[PDB]
Symmetry: C4
């Protein structure tokens, strides 16, 4: 037999970290890090954080308050001075040929940051590494709203720099929820307004998939699984807990997941295990599902799924007008 | 609180751009850019544009008229003459050992351009970067039509050069719709005829997915969602708007999306929000869906989906002949 | 307007090609090309062809007869002798430290060739570049049949050398069908028997997807689309054409697609356009579909799909024994 | 005709192999191999095996007993001493600046090993190379259980080192089942307890997909395919064989696949070919299927699928309470 010993955690350790540099250097740092060979010199996350600081004045100080270092680790240490340097708070080169950003560079930074912040609001980098045509559509919509629709296709100067590492890094920080809350509740001047319009659409019910799946089930299910007593008693509790949270949080209710609010857990599957089981079962059949703590069984869900419920009748006859419209498409009536 | 400031657009900026070189140099430029190490010297989009100019005589001048530069940016600037050179209008080498294209090189250029132009007509590079077995099938069909079926498999000399960047770049230009219109309406000599036969098949109803989804729904839906009054009133309007557009555009009607015609917006979901909602709902159930401006609700769609409509009866008895055919496959009759 | 001119094919051209070397050198060539740095020196397809020649004695001469060159193009020409050398018929190094293959190297070559030949039989490299867990399962089954099940996991010495280019290249050659026919009809000694057992399973009805989809539809469809007259008349013709082909080809009938037999076209969608349309429609609904030349419409298919057919009744009562078995799983009877 | 000869296996051969080094060097070896440039010096599997030895005290000796070499092959041989060295049992550098692991390095090793061991229990690397968001969720759950939830996102120091090769290598060794059995039955101290909690969840019914698919079918199927006599007789045998195995193996029953127990074959499709065919058919329709040795036909499965069975009735009236709850969601009663 193995003895049952296991590797134990040590205490502390310095690991490499990204940084944000100095506030006075944001623009010069951002311009320098538009170049891949410059990005290669630093921790991969650093340029994404610098770009965010450029995008949103005031964010640099917020990051500093959250404990984000000014210094970024270097990709390779340098022995410049008999001393070994592993990090620096400046990212632009000795060759300080300061230029300004171009319009297309700005749109490209917006593209990078749009993907980055979508990942932060949804709490995952998996889609940005992959499920990305929907992200491009959001960016195109933003660029159209800013009267620059061509940039939806052409603002590709950072296309090779995927923000996935920075999504993960931000998602692991204790202040991520506060960061999201600030983005969602700040009234930004254009073009920030248009930028955040897209982030707000994505953030709505983000990380509240149990809640939205149950809501879909309660609206759309046409079978008797809804009537299984342990499910039904949880339906009443779910609607009441939801109502209490809606009253308490008002316009922030759809953002509870995105802001990592502790109340979001009140709408997790463990809170309504039988109802979540039934809704997940329905959802997978319409497109295991049995949750920890549920007493309902798959065999019961199967049997009740075969029985129909009613959501009211609406008339056994079409109006003459609707009958005529139906004739246009080859429909003769109700069956 | 963040102050609500946001990064502002600057005005202007020179960014790197591809180019098309000079008309007299198209073939020499194309031959040179068949080599990956030569392509590495220039903006990634340049060779795709040069190949298009080789494919279609007359296109170079059209591109020039649209504002496409002759000069391509270089991958790396050169300090040749105390002056810094960042771009050039010639892509072939000092070593000017001019050869002609081989048959297989021509088919390979056709392959590259086939993928490129499919992306341009559909308005997306996502499938060419990925969903590509269907594209190979179109290319194989072209090569068979040109009595060179083996080239469908073997014309792979540009297989490592994916046109995705050039798709995006072209899709961002103001003349893209005119470019597509010219391809679709020009009577090309062989082998252009056969090439464009494939592009025309792909372009038919490209970027008109709302229109085709609604048409599918109106033809195939067998439930009462069609009869929901707000849906039904939009069905009549949709069929009439469609008829007006068909009259106005005739043989170009299926190409309105591909040519980026402003009338295409008359068939977008915002134009028929309730009908689009019902058709999208049906479409996802057969394979949210509620559109901005729609009053129909998912719960209503669910309830009506459970009620059948009729599209006419056809007889309660099979013919003796059809009954006998049904016996061949183990079918005893209607149920 | 564009003038309607298009790029014309040239005649001839020498392009790079793979080669098979000399028969006496097969084993030494194969051993040398097990090393990636050696493979990098030659056309990418060459090692796959050499490995096939090693796998199957006699194949080298067959390839020579089919016009396959002994010489492979080099990745880079060499100016060795004031003359420029672009190709060679020997692939092993001056350092001629001849060793024999190991058991694990042999299994690794079998792995590479298994993937390669699956691609050749199915006529596509798309799955080998991707849909590959099913291929590994076939290889594991082979290795188990050869009393070397561990090699199903460990024979990975060629894992970085994907055969996709060689699949495409072979699939473009005029002799591919004859090559497949020879593999399927030769009685190989072990371990060839076990190897080809897997290839034969994959080859069965490969590239006969229209035929197998229609057969599935005729066996499994439970709706009245089968009874639409234009569909039904084609069902009778399809079953009779199929019967004629089965009589003519006997045990080779399932291989008509794999061997690129001209009779395979008699079972293509163009041969039975209404039936193929109905079967494809059914198939997509159970998991456009309207074929060129079909008169049946999607709206008709939709309407008939809603009507049930019968395939006979079997009794309204379960046997006492079957009733008792049903009680074991919570089933009370027929409904 | 080809002669029917085929490549024959040779006997023996030395191939490259990974190694585990010496027990006294585990930690120093692990620290060294946290660096990619050091990993590049050795067989790809070596660091994964070293990390496992670090994770679980006692495992090194178990591996030695199973025949795992101490020496790892080098990526490149060295001619250090007029002798050619191809392998070594030490992986840390001459520059022996011994440091301890950081907390984040430990969590990163846990991440790597979590993915590795999931692959070993399920018997496949395909998901770890790809289907990986579910794996990250398990790791996040572990890190939360260890009061280090941020590490679920941030412990990415080995993110570029995918364990797929080590999964395959371990899966090919004769002792893999014993290895899994030891992991599943050892009572580990924290943080091993929490680590193995996740592995145990994944291992439950791993590689017993036929068993779990049949169980799902027997619980959830609502059609008469269950009553086809050859299917039904196998249902009774399946439930009895399952009961015998449950009695014999008790708490290890769900792990029979994971531990590569010979009894797992008693629940393979060949053991119940008609039942497996029916369950697979149902499963694919709810989300060929006909198994070798089955007499049931797809056409029979199709016909019986259209007939409903009953699993008992539960009342034709809702309770007043359940009726009122149904009113909250727009449901008026049973239909």
């Amino acid at each position: 037999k193995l003895p049952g010993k296991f590797l134990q955690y040590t205490v502390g350790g310095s690991d490499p970290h990204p940084g944000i540099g100095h506030e006075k250097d944001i623009r010069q740092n951002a311009v320098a890090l538009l170049d891949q060979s410059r990005r290669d010199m630093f921790h991969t996350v650093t340029p994404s954080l610098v770009f965010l600081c450029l995008l949103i004045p005031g964010l640099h100080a917020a990051f500093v308050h959250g404990g984000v270092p000014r210094e970024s680790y270097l990709s390779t240490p340098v022995t410049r001075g008999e001393q070994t340097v592993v990090k620096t708070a400046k990212f632009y080169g000795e060759k300080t040929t300061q230029r300004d950003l171009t319009e297309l560079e700005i749109s490209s930074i917006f593209s990078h940051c749009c993907s980055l912040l979508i990942g932060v609001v949804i709490g995952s980098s998996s889609k940005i590494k992959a499920g990305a045509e929907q992200i491009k559509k959001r960016f195109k919509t933003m660029m159209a709203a800013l009267n620059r629709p061509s940039h939806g296709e052409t603002a590709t100067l950072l296309q090779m720099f995927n923000p996935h590492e920075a999504i993960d890094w931000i998602n692991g920080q204790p202040w991520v929820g506060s960061f999201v809350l600030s983005l969602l509740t700040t009234d930004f001047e254009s073009p920030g307004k248009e930028f955040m319009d897209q982030i707000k659409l994505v953030a709505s019910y983000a990380q509240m998939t149990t809640y939205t799946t149950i809501k879909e089930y309660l609206a759309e299910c046409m079978d008797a699984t809804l009537t299984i007593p342990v499910v039904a008693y949880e339906i009443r509790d779910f609607l009441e807990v939801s109502a209490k949270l809606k009253e308490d949080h008002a316009d922030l209710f759809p953002f509870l997941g995105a802001i990592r609010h502790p109340d979001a857990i009140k709408l997790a599957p463990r809170s309504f295990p039988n109802l979540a089981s039934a809704a997940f079962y329905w959802s997978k059949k319409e497109n295991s599902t049995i949750q920890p703590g549920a007493s309902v069984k798959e065999t019961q869900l199967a049997r009740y799924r075969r029985r129909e419920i009613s959501r009211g009748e609406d008339g056994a006859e079409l109006s003459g007008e609707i009958s005529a419209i139906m004739k246009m498409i080859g429909v003769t009536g109700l069956n």
